[PDB]
Design a protein around this ligand. Structure first.
Ligand SMILES: Cc1cc(NNc2ccc(C(=O)Nc3ccccc3N)cc2)c(N)cc1O
Length: 125
């Protein structure tokens, strides 16, 4: 189809390891963004067929979304917090580079990113 397989969310051979930063990323950062009124366009992978988004996957090489991030955190997929932070950054970058400035989707992304950056500024050491 026009859509790729969704990003992997589990690593069956990675040992389980918790960090307080990963706990914060799930229980504070992801939870806060997930419950925000503007979360809905970002809660699942972009479906370029259903959304009629021409060339989305020609332009966006590394799709990412908060449903994938949520599952990765729940499944202890990330070895470290910085991998998770990178996924959030990629999600926002994809939106800003594909869509036109001032499209509603971009303004929603910016509100979520502002909240994200606020919480990251309090990331535990
Ligand atoms: C990251 C990113 C996302 C998107 N849109 N994502 C969407 C758009 C719409 C919906 C929706 O459910 N609408 C909806 C709202 C109310 C009643 C029923 C329905 N169906 C879900 C996701 C675009 N375009 C560009 C983009 O870069």
């Amino acid at each position: 189809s026009m859509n790729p397989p969704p990003p992997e969310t589990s690593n069956p051979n990675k040992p389980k390891r918790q960090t307080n930063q990963l706990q914060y990323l799930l229980r504070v950062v992801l939870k806060t963004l997930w419950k925000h009124q503007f979360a809905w366009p970002f809660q699942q992978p972009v479906d370029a067929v259903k959304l009629n988004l021409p060339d989305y996957y020609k332009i966006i090489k590394t799709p990412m979304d908060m449903g994938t991030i949520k599952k990765r955190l729940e499944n202890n997929y990330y070895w470290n917090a910085q991998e998770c932070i990178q996924d959030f950054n990629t999600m926002f970058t994809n939106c800003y580079i594909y869509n036109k400035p001032g499209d509603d989707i971009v303004l929603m992304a910016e509100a979520l990113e502002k909240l994200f950056l606020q919480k990251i500024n309090e990331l535990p050491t």
